């Protein structure tokens, strides 16, 4: 049923190790952060901080 | 003292990006070492 479209290509091995990556808000947006350690999922976090 | 997990370097993996089935090259010759932490578990409850 589903058209299995082969996309055959070249597959050379290469070094692949994760590196840290920050995600930042541009031009007028701010990223909150719950500095509180005991976290519960939803709910209040009376230790918030903007970064 | 040390608990071990036996495993293989698979090739035909299901892509985590979407519904697919990739296939990669045979593993290289040499030592492939990775000393990595474990900071998480994913669990689910029993059916009944």
């Amino acid at each position: 049923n589903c058209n299995t479209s082969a996309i055959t290509q070249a597959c050379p091995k290469v070094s692949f190790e994760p590196i840290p990556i920050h995600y930042c808000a541009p031009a007028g947006f701010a990223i909150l952060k719950c500095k509180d350690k005991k976290f519960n999922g939803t709910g209040p976090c009376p230790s918030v901080s903007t970064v | 003292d040390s608990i071990t997990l036996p495993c293989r370097i698979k090739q035909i993996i299901n892509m985590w990006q979407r519904i697919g089935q990739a296939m990669y090259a045979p593993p290289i010759q040499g030592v492939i070492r990775c000393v990595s932490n474990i900071t998480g578990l994913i669990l689910t409850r029993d059916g009944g």
Partner: antibody
Amino acid sequence: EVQLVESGAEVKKPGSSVKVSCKASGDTFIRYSFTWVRQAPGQGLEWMGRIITILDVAHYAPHLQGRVTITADKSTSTVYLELRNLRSDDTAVYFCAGVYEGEADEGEYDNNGFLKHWGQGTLVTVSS
Amino acid sequence: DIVMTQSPATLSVSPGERATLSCRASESVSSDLAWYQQKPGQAPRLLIYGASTRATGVPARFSGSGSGAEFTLTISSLQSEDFAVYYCQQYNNWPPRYTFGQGTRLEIKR
């Protein structure tokens, strides 16, 4: 160890299409890779195409591309070669070949390029 | 396609002595050449794969080696059934546009 039986010799006319089946037995059919190779009379082997059974994908030779489709069915566990636009000098002996590549169902795959197991060899002669 | 030229193409050596067969690669095939033996009448048989590794159920007297653009298959002692056409097929390229060899010719000394 594991034998493959090919279909009988078939004779057709130019402008038609031909189909030849190679049936593999002895192991699990789906755990194999199959290469179709042809030999012209008095000429060296000619690599036609390849198919990965676990994955159902084929790659054919460029100069021969466009008139050949290689398929396979795991239910009956056999691989079919289909050739279009038959023409005289294409008279030749056709060979199926199969190679074991590791535990393919679970995810392991070697992708060997050589040929180990062979069919008995069908003969196709297209002429007047 | 991919061309395969060899120089010298073939040399004449009388049967009864040790003979070596040389396969030349147009491209840089690391260890991806296999050797097949075809006596006339049926399908060929793989002997060396990986350009060095012996196939299962084949005599160990045959010895293949080489890399890059130069590969050589050597016999130790000739046998009655070891007079056939030897094909050297490379499979280094990907996607698999593999190309076979040309075989080796031996003439009947009448």
